[PDB]
């Protein structure tokens, strides 16, 4: 297989044939039982290797394959791809990614290093147009701290999160609402014929 990968789904047969023609638990067990060299040579097959087993290279189709199924990604490029305001649901995907990958203190210090202008841009963009998203907002707030945050933007964030927590309490109440002698002394009744 090494000679194949040097001269260039299923076990290793289909992937090797695909590589030679272009030149996944079972696939992982067949091509992981040298790996760094194979990855460097290869860099579809990239997608399979990402799903199975150069973080800066992963930083530099395969975009979503990396932000969903890449083993090693650094938080600086991760928040760069997150704070890119393209919004192809990348906000939710990379928020889920950072919460899956790293620690709250790490995100705190990373967004301490991160600039304030894109912080204000992301706050305005979230307030304009999700537990991961609001955990990211709480992370943004306790990373920027106590001093530098605009009053008008604070009023906007107050309005946003207040109306949202009203509607969220409403939604929880309705959700669990979905989760939920003899005859008198004298009456008048008629019979059939």
């Amino acid at each position: 297989v090494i000679e194949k990968l040097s001269a260039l789904t299923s076990f290793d047969d289909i992937f090797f044939k695909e590589l030679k023609i272009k030149e996944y638990i079972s696939d992982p067990g067949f091509l992981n039982k040298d790996l760094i060299f194979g990855k460097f040579s290869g860099n579809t097959f990239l997608l399979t290797h990402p799903l199975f087993p150069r973080n800066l290279l992963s930083l530099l189709r395969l975009f979503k394959q990396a932000i969903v199924t890449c083993p090693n990604l650094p938080l600086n490029e991760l928040l760069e791809e997150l704070f890119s305001i393209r919004n192809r649901e990348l906000l939710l995907d990379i928020s889920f990614r950072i919460l899956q990958d790293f620690t709250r203190d790490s995100i705190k210090q990373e967004m301490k290093k991160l600039s304030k202008l894109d912080v204000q841009n992301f706050i305005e963009f979230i307030t304009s147009g999700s537990t991961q998203l609001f955990q990211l907002l709480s992370l943004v707030l306790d990373s920027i701290g106590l001093f530098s945050l605009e009053g008008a933007l604070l009023e906007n964030l107050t309005l946003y999160i207040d109306k949202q927590v009203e509607i969220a309490e409403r939604n929880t109440e309705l959700w669990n609402l979905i989760d939920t002698r003899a005859l008198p002394t004298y009456t008048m009744e008629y019979l059939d014929i």
């Binding site: 002698r181 003899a182 019979l191 014929i193």
Partner: protein, 46 residues
């Protein structure tokens, strides 16, 4: 043809008060006026 109603199991006096109106004078012996204390033989429901 005929019919017999089983919706009135206790009854003291049935008659015709008026041109068509009936009187079914029923009873309720235990649940209202007597209320004499009965023995507690508990039925295991589970």
């Amino acid at each position: 043809h005929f019919f017999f109603t089983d919706k009135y199991k206790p009854l003291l006096f049935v008659d015709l008060i008026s041109s068509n109106e009936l009187a079914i004078i029923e009873r309720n012996p235990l649940t209202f006026h007597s209320k004499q204390k009965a023995f507690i033989q508990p039925k295991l429901v589970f």
